[PDB]
Amino acid sequence: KVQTITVGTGTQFPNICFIDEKGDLTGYDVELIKELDKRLPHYKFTFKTMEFSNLLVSLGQHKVDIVAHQMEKSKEREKKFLFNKVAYNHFPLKITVLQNNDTIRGIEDLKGKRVITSATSNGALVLKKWNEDNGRPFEIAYEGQGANETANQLKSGRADATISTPFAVDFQNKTSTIKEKTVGNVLSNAKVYFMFNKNEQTLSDDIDKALQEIIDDGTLKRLSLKWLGDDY
């Protein structure tokens, strides 16, 4: 009969996995999981939400069977988990500034400027590596107080730029008075995959089959354009 699959995801990732004003869990990853459910009659996907910092521990302990949170591969992760074969998205990162700031064309125009970012994020590493390989022209600052810290600093001028993805900038503009924009070329564009507990290989393969079906009939493209835009 139908096998129940527990999906671990979040509620604080705008456009990916979040709660909208209506009050329901939605976003690209959540909607894709629901689409897969429709495509897989022998499976039933249920959700289990939690802080991002508990997703992988939960997956390893098999509290969830799959994790959906725009996850990327890494050496460490591949040793402890399984990744399906079909990437379902790319994660473009670009220098991001205050909408009315016209002094910055890209990462190369930051000599003497201050860039704010999240100490944990992959964007933080991207910035660091580039800054290190180019004579450290700018200062990297990390946020720590509370939310909206990056936007507030961009607004005041305390920060000249940050690094973000286009879909995050779109959400910022739709929900805040502080407007932002991306400038320059894509600095990083990592592939995104679902992650699995080591015991779920059959499930991962079945999901890859469904994803090919979703890609082939244009459903994935439709979903990415709706939630992420065309930069994906």
PDB file of C-alpha atoms in Angstrom:
ATOM      1  CA  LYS A   1       0.000   0.000   0.000  1.00  0.00           C
ATOM      2  CA  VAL A   2       0.979   3.658   0.422  1.00  0.00           C
ATOM      3  CA  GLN A   3       4.182   4.371   2.350  1.00  0.00           C
ATOM      4  CA  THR A   4       4.238   7.516   4.497  1.00  0.00           C
ATOM      5  CA  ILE A   5       7.308   9.715   4.033  1.00  0.00           C
ATOM      6  CA  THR A   6       8.262  12.390   6.549  1.00  0.00           C
ATOM      7  CA  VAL A   7       9.689  15.566   5.033  1.00  0.00           C
ATOM      8  CA  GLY A   8      11.778  17.851   7.182  1.00  0.00           C
ATOM      9  CA  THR A   9      11.730  21.514   6.176  1.00  0.00           C
ATOM     10  CA  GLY A  10      11.479  25.036   7.596  1.00  0.00           C
ATOM     11  CA  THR A  11       8.994  27.866   8.044  1.00  0.00           C
ATOM     12  CA  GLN A  12      11.410  30.822   7.831  1.00  0.00           C
ATOM     13  CA  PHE A  13      12.799  30.724   4.269  1.00  0.00           C
ATOM     14  CA  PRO A  14      10.816  33.224   2.131  1.00  0.00           C
ATOM     15  CA  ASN A  15       9.683  31.850  -1.249  1.00  0.00           C
ATOM     16  CA  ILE A  16      11.119  28.405  -0.373  1.00  0.00           C
ATOM     17  CA  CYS A  17       9.419  27.187   2.846  1.00  0.00           C
ATOM     18  CA  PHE A  18       7.481  29.755   4.813  1.00  0.00           C
ATOM     19  CA  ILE A  19       4.040  30.599   6.129  1.00  0.00           C
ATOM     20  CA  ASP A  20       2.123  33.096   4.003  1.00  0.00           C
ATOM     21  CA  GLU A  21      -0.406  35.661   5.240  1.00  0.00           C
ATOM     22  CA  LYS A  22      -3.215  33.173   4.612  1.00  0.00           C
ATOM     23  CA  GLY A  23      -1.548  31.030   7.241  1.00  0.00           C
ATOM     24  CA  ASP A  24      -0.278  28.036   5.282  1.00  0.00           C
ATOM     25  CA  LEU A  25       3.120  26.445   4.650  1.00  0.00           C
ATOM     26  CA  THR A  26       4.199  27.125   1.064  1.00  0.00           C
ATOM     27  CA  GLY A  27       7.107  28.226  -1.134  1.00  0.00           C
ATOM     28  CA  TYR A  28       9.086  26.500  -3.909  1.00  0.00           C
ATOM     29  CA  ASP A  29      10.353  23.508  -1.907  1.00  0.00           C
ATOM     30  CA  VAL A  30       7.027  22.824  -0.198  1.00  0.00           C
ATOM     31  CA  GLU A  31       5.071  23.096  -3.431  1.00  0.00           C
ATOM     32  CA  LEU A  32       7.560  20.840  -5.203  1.00  0.00           C
ATOM     33  CA  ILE A  33       7.175  18.216  -2.462  1.00  0.00           C
ATOM     34  CA  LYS A  34       3.399  18.412  -2.909  1.00  0.00           C
ATOM     35  CA  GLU A  35       3.802  18.031  -6.673  1.00  0.00           C
ATOM     36  CA  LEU A  36       5.996  14.935  -6.174  1.00  0.00           C
ATOM     37  CA  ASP A  37       3.303  13.514  -3.887  1.00  0.00           C
ATOM     38  CA  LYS A  38       0.766  13.811  -6.719  1.00  0.00           C
ATOM     39  CA  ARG A  39       3.229  12.067  -9.050  1.00  0.00           C
ATOM     40  CA  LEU A  40       3.963   9.184  -6.692  1.00  0.00           C
ATOM     41  CA  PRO A  41       0.841   7.089  -5.903  1.00  0.00           C
ATOM     42  CA  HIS A  42       2.787   4.661  -3.706  1.00  0.00           C
ATOM     43  CA  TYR A  43       3.975   7.421  -1.365  1.00  0.00           C
ATOM     44  CA  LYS A  44       2.330   9.919   0.970  1.00  0.00           C
ATOM     45  CA  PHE A  45       4.393  12.970   1.930  1.00  0.00           C
ATOM     46  CA  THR A  46       3.815  14.543   5.348  1.00  0.00           C
ATOM     47  CA  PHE A  47       5.665  17.473   6.892  1.00  0.00           C
ATOM     48  CA  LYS A  48       7.706  18.045  10.034  1.00  0.00           C
ATOM     49  CA  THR A  49       9.049  21.585  10.432  1.00  0.00           C
ATOM     50  CA  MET A  50      11.952  22.661  12.598  1.00  0.00           C
ATOM     51  CA  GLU A  51      14.814  25.112  13.031  1.00  0.00           C
ATOM     52  CA  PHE A  52      17.330  24.776  10.193  1.00  0.00           C
ATOM     53  CA  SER A  53      19.984  23.741  12.719  1.00  0.00           C
ATOM     54  CA  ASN A  54      18.054  20.566  13.548  1.00  0.00           C
ATOM     55  CA  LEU A  55      17.236  19.323  10.052  1.00  0.00           C
ATOM     56  CA  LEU A  56      20.363  17.231   9.470  1.00  0.00           C
ATOM     57  CA  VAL A  57      20.563  15.788  12.991  1.00  0.00           C
ATOM     58  CA  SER A  58      16.918  14.855  12.552  1.00  0.00           C
ATOM     59  CA  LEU A  59      17.585  13.280   9.137  1.00  0.00           C
ATOM     60  CA  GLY A  60      20.495  11.270  10.520  1.00  0.00           C
ATOM     61  CA  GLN A  61      18.396   9.978  13.414  1.00  0.00           C
ATOM     62  CA  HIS A  62      15.768   9.101  10.818  1.00  0.00           C
ATOM     63  CA  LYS A  63      13.184  11.384  12.494  1.00  0.00           C
ATOM     64  CA  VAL A  64      12.511  12.566   8.931  1.00  0.00           C
ATOM     65  CA  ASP A  65      13.186  10.649   5.713  1.00  0.00           C
ATOM     66  CA  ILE A  66      14.038  13.547   3.447  1.00  0.00           C
ATOM     67  CA  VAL A  67      15.103  17.158   3.914  1.00  0.00           C
ATOM     68  CA  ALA A  68      13.926  19.932   1.588  1.00  0.00           C
ATOM     69  CA  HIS A  69      15.618  23.272   2.284  1.00  0.00           C
ATOM     70  CA  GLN A  70      17.489  24.362  -0.866  1.00  0.00           C
ATOM     71  CA  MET A  71      20.295  22.046   0.254  1.00  0.00           C
ATOM     72  CA  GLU A  72      23.688  21.886  -1.447  1.00  0.00           C
ATOM     73  CA  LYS A  73      26.303  19.140  -1.554  1.00  0.00           C
ATOM     74  CA  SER A  74      29.472  19.140   0.540  1.00  0.00           C
ATOM     75  CA  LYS A  75      32.141  16.563   1.336  1.00  0.00           C
ATOM     76  CA  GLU A  76      30.922  16.144   4.922  1.00  0.00           C
ATOM     77  CA  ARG A  77      27.258  15.822   3.956  1.00  0.00           C
ATOM     78  CA  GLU A  78      27.892  13.199   1.269  1.00  0.00           C
ATOM     79  CA  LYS A  79      29.646  11.008   3.835  1.00  0.00           C
ATOM     80  CA  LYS A  80      26.617  11.031   6.152  1.00  0.00           C
ATOM     81  CA  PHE A  81      23.692  11.383   3.736  1.00  0.00           C
ATOM     82  CA  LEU A  82      22.350  10.545   0.286  1.00  0.00           C
ATOM     83  CA  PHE A  83      21.552  13.103  -2.428  1.00  0.00           C
ATOM     84  CA  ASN A  84      19.152  12.395  -5.272  1.00  0.00           C
ATOM     85  CA  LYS A  85      20.636  12.594  -8.779  1.00  0.00           C
ATOM     86  CA  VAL A  86      18.402  15.331 -10.249  1.00  0.00           C
ATOM     87  CA  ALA A  87      19.159  18.860  -8.989  1.00  0.00           C
ATOM     88  CA  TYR A  88      15.851  20.692  -8.751  1.00  0.00           C
ATOM     89  CA  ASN A  89      17.261  24.209  -8.660  1.00  0.00           C
ATOM     90  CA  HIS A  90      20.380  26.395  -8.797  1.00  0.00           C
ATOM     91  CA  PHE A  91      21.165  28.966  -6.094  1.00  0.00           C
ATOM     92  CA  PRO A  92      22.435  32.170  -7.752  1.00  0.00           C
ATOM     93  CA  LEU A  93      24.162  34.676  -5.463  1.00  0.00           C
ATOM     94  CA  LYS A  94      24.783  38.300  -6.394  1.00  0.00           C
ATOM     95  CA  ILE A  95      26.081  41.434  -4.718  1.00  0.00           C
ATOM     96  CA  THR A  96      23.017  43.252  -3.360  1.00  0.00           C
ATOM     97  CA  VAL A  97      22.568  46.948  -2.577  1.00  0.00           C
ATOM     98  CA  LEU A  98      20.043  49.630  -1.634  1.00  0.00           C
ATOM     99  CA  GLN A  99      17.734  50.148  -4.621  1.00  0.00           C
ATOM    100  CA  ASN A 100      18.742  53.798  -5.104  1.00  0.00           C
ATOM    101  CA  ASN A 101      22.490  53.135  -4.794  1.00  0.00           C
ATOM    102  CA  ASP A 102      24.128  53.517  -8.213  1.00  0.00           C
ATOM    103  CA  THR A 103      27.780  53.547  -7.122  1.00  0.00           C
ATOM    104  CA  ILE A 104      28.270  49.762  -7.220  1.00  0.00           C
ATOM    105  CA  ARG A 105      28.291  47.743 -10.464  1.00  0.00           C
ATOM    106  CA  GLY A 106      29.544  44.522  -8.937  1.00  0.00           C
ATOM    107  CA  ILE A 107      31.880  42.921  -6.427  1.00  0.00           C
ATOM    108  CA  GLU A 108      34.787  44.797  -8.075  1.00  0.00           C
ATOM    109  CA  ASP A 109      33.435  48.210  -7.005  1.00  0.00           C
ATOM    110  CA  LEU A 110      33.764  47.620  -3.271  1.00  0.00           C
ATOM    111  CA  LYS A 111      37.231  49.010  -2.562  1.00  0.00           C
ATOM    112  CA  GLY A 112      37.026  50.598   0.885  1.00  0.00           C
ATOM    113  CA  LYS A 113      33.415  49.590   1.411  1.00  0.00           C
ATOM    114  CA  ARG A 114      31.638  47.493   4.031  1.00  0.00           C
ATOM    115  CA  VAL A 115      29.756  44.303   3.147  1.00  0.00           C
ATOM    116  CA  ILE A 116      27.328  42.794   5.685  1.00  0.00           C
ATOM    117  CA  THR A 117      26.409  39.103   5.705  1.00  0.00           C
ATOM    118  CA  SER A 118      25.383  36.059   7.771  1.00  0.00           C
ATOM    119  CA  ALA A 119      28.342  34.355   9.469  1.00  0.00           C
ATOM    120  CA  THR A 120      26.865  30.935   8.659  1.00  0.00           C
ATOM    121  CA  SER A 121      25.647  31.426   5.072  1.00  0.00           C
ATOM    122  CA  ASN A 122      27.375  30.091   1.962  1.00  0.00           C
ATOM    123  CA  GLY A 123      27.275  33.626   0.617  1.00  0.00           C
ATOM    124  CA  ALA A 124      29.539  34.596   3.497  1.00  0.00           C
ATOM    125  CA  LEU A 125      32.117  32.063   2.285  1.00  0.00           C
ATOM    126  CA  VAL A 126      31.763  33.215  -1.319  1.00  0.00           C
ATOM    127  CA  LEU A 127      32.512  36.793  -0.245  1.00  0.00           C
ATOM    128  CA  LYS A 128      35.435  35.734   1.947  1.00  0.00           C
ATOM    129  CA  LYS A 129      37.092  33.650  -0.755  1.00  0.00           C
ATOM    130  CA  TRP A 130      36.795  36.414  -3.338  1.00  0.00           C
ATOM    131  CA  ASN A 131      37.968  39.083  -0.899  1.00  0.00           C
ATOM    132  CA  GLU A 132      40.960  36.902   0.047  1.00  0.00           C
ATOM    133  CA  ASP A 133      41.977  36.299  -3.580  1.00  0.00           C
ATOM    134  CA  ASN A 134      41.753  39.958  -4.572  1.00  0.00           C
ATOM    135  CA  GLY A 135      43.755  41.829  -1.957  1.00  0.00           C
ATOM    136  CA  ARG A 136      40.920  42.185   0.561  1.00  0.00           C
ATOM    137  CA  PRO A 137      39.577  45.410  -0.996  1.00  0.00           C
ATOM    138  CA  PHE A 138      36.506  45.472   1.281  1.00  0.00           C
ATOM    139  CA  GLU A 139      35.445  44.768   4.861  1.00  0.00           C
ATOM    140  CA  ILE A 140      33.178  41.835   5.591  1.00  0.00           C
ATOM    141  CA  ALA A 141      30.866  42.351   8.555  1.00  0.00           C
ATOM    142  CA  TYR A 142      28.607  39.775  10.182  1.00  0.00           C
ATOM    143  CA  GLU A 143      25.132  40.407  11.589  1.00  0.00           C
ATOM    144  CA  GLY A 144      24.138  39.086  15.002  1.00  0.00           C
ATOM    145  CA  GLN A 145      21.492  41.210  16.709  1.00  0.00           C
ATOM    146  CA  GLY A 146      18.093  40.490  15.144  1.00  0.00           C
ATOM    147  CA  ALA A 147      16.320  40.154  11.792  1.00  0.00           C
ATOM    148  CA  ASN A 148      16.272  42.882   9.142  1.00  0.00           C
ATOM    149  CA  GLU A 149      19.740  43.923  10.332  1.00  0.00           C
ATOM    150  CA  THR A 150      21.127  43.809   6.795  1.00  0.00           C
ATOM    151  CA  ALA A 151      18.301  45.925   5.367  1.00  0.00           C
ATOM    152  CA  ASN A 152      18.561  48.469   8.176  1.00  0.00           C
ATOM    153  CA  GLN A 153      22.303  48.851   7.644  1.00  0.00           C
ATOM    154  CA  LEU A 154      21.892  49.218   3.885  1.00  0.00           C
ATOM    155  CA  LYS A 155      19.258  51.898   4.522  1.00  0.00           C
ATOM    156  CA  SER A 156      21.461  53.917   6.884  1.00  0.00           C
ATOM    157  CA  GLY A 157      24.568  53.467   4.770  1.00  0.00           C
ATOM    158  CA  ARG A 158      26.353  51.621   7.580  1.00  0.00           C
ATOM    159  CA  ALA A 159      26.627  48.795   5.053  1.00  0.00           C
ATOM    160  CA  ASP A 160      27.298  49.401   1.366  1.00  0.00           C
ATOM    161  CA  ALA A 161      26.185  45.975   0.214  1.00  0.00           C
ATOM    162  CA  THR A 162      25.374  42.381   1.102  1.00  0.00           C
ATOM    163  CA  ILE A 163      25.189  39.150  -0.894  1.00  0.00           C
ATOM    164  CA  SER A 164      21.831  37.625  -1.681  1.00  0.00           C
ATOM    165  CA  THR A 165      19.771  35.576  -4.113  1.00  0.00           C
ATOM    166  CA  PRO A 166      17.265  37.234  -6.468  1.00  0.00           C
ATOM    167  CA  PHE A 167      14.216  35.555  -4.929  1.00  0.00           C
ATOM    168  CA  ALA A 168      15.172  36.810  -1.458  1.00  0.00           C
ATOM    169  CA  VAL A 169      15.511  40.364  -2.794  1.00  0.00           C
ATOM    170  CA  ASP A 170      12.086  40.086  -4.399  1.00  0.00           C
ATOM    171  CA  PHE A 171      10.496  39.075  -1.090  1.00  0.00           C
ATOM    172  CA  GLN A 172      12.287  41.917   0.720  1.00  0.00           C
ATOM    173  CA  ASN A 173      10.837  44.463  -1.711  1.00  0.00           C
ATOM    174  CA  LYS A 174       7.319  43.049  -1.478  1.00  0.00           C
ATOM    175  CA  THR A 175       7.241  43.106   2.323  1.00  0.00           C
ATOM    176  CA  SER A 176       9.415  46.076   3.288  1.00  0.00           C
ATOM    177  CA  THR A 177       9.868  49.810   2.717  1.00  0.00           C
ATOM    178  CA  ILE A 178      13.624  49.337   2.385  1.00  0.00           C
ATOM    179  CA  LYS A 179      14.107  48.318  -1.247  1.00  0.00           C
ATOM    180  CA  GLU A 180      17.098  46.409  -2.602  1.00  0.00           C
ATOM    181  CA  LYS A 181      18.461  45.294  -5.969  1.00  0.00           C
ATOM    182  CA  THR A 182      21.115  42.918  -7.246  1.00  0.00           C
ATOM    183  CA  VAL A 183      24.006  44.201  -9.368  1.00  0.00           C
ATOM    184  CA  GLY A 184      26.811  42.458 -11.210  1.00  0.00           C
ATOM    185  CA  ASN A 185      27.289  38.883 -12.339  1.00  0.00           C
ATOM    186  CA  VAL A 186      26.320  35.670 -10.562  1.00  0.00           C
ATOM    187  CA  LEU A 187      29.108  34.982  -8.070  1.00  0.00           C
ATOM    188  CA  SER A 188      28.008  31.466  -7.138  1.00  0.00           C
ATOM    189  CA  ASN A 189      25.430  29.121  -8.648  1.00  0.00           C
ATOM    190  CA  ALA A 190      25.421  25.853  -6.683  1.00  0.00           C
ATOM    191  CA  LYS A 191      23.073  22.970  -7.508  1.00  0.00           C
ATOM    192  CA  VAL A 192      20.272  22.226  -5.060  1.00  0.00           C
ATOM    193  CA  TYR A 193      19.243  18.688  -4.093  1.00  0.00           C
ATOM    194  CA  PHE A 194      16.981  16.812  -1.697  1.00  0.00           C
ATOM    195  CA  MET A 195      18.905  15.070   1.120  1.00  0.00           C
ATOM    196  CA  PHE A 196      18.109  11.603   2.449  1.00  0.00           C
ATOM    197  CA  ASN A 197      18.778   9.319   5.365  1.00  0.00           C
ATOM    198  CA  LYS A 198      21.226   6.596   4.256  1.00  0.00           C
ATOM    199  CA  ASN A 199      18.380   4.055   4.306  1.00  0.00           C
ATOM    200  CA  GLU A 200      16.197   5.790   1.687  1.00  0.00           C
ATOM    201  CA  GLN A 201      17.881   4.999  -1.656  1.00  0.00           C
ATOM    202  CA  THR A 202      14.724   3.551  -3.221  1.00  0.00           C
ATOM    203  CA  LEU A 203      12.786   6.695  -2.259  1.00  0.00           C
ATOM    204  CA  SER A 204      15.487   8.940  -3.734  1.00  0.00           C
ATOM    205  CA  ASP A 205      15.437   7.031  -7.033  1.00  0.00           C
ATOM    206  CA  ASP A 206      11.638   7.140  -7.177  1.00  0.00           C
ATOM    207  CA  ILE A 207      11.776  10.883  -6.590  1.00  0.00           C
ATOM    208  CA  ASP A 208      14.292  11.326  -9.427  1.00  0.00           C
ATOM    209  CA  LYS A 209      11.884   9.544 -11.760  1.00  0.00           C
ATOM    210  CA  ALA A 210       9.059  11.875 -10.739  1.00  0.00           C
ATOM    211  CA  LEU A 211      11.299  14.941 -11.090  1.00  0.00           C
ATOM    212  CA  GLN A 212      12.127  13.980 -14.674  1.00  0.00           C
ATOM    213  CA  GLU A 213       8.373  13.763 -15.301  1.00  0.00           C
ATOM    214  CA  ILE A 214       7.875  17.169 -13.666  1.00  0.00           C
ATOM    215  CA  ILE A 215      10.726  18.663 -15.710  1.00  0.00           C
ATOM    216  CA  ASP A 216       9.559  17.131 -19.012  1.00  0.00           C
ATOM    217  CA  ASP A 217       5.997  18.497 -18.952  1.00  0.00           C
ATOM    218  CA  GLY A 218       7.057  22.003 -17.943  1.00  0.00           C
ATOM    219  CA  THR A 219       5.793  21.832 -14.362  1.00  0.00           C
ATOM    220  CA  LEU A 220       9.174  22.520 -12.772  1.00  0.00           C
ATOM    221  CA  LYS A 221       9.809  25.506 -15.050  1.00  0.00           C
ATOM    222  CA  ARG A 222       6.359  26.879 -14.169  1.00  0.00           C
ATOM    223  CA  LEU A 223       7.011  26.448 -10.456  1.00  0.00           C
ATOM    224  CA  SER A 224      10.469  28.042 -10.572  1.00  0.00           C
ATOM    225  CA  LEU A 225       9.208  31.063 -12.525  1.00  0.00           C
ATOM    226  CA  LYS A 226       6.355  31.569 -10.076  1.00  0.00           C
ATOM    227  CA  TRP A 227       8.471  31.346  -6.907  1.00  0.00           C
ATOM    228  CA  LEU A 228      12.015  32.194  -7.995  1.00  0.00           C
ATOM    229  CA  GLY A 229      11.976  34.180 -11.228  1.00  0.00           C
ATOM    230  CA  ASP A 230      13.986  33.465 -14.378  1.00  0.00           C
ATOM    231  CA  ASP A 231      17.482  33.599 -12.840  1.00  0.00           C
ATOM    232  CA  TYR A 232      17.057  29.926 -11.940  1.00  0.00           C
TER     233      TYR A 232
END
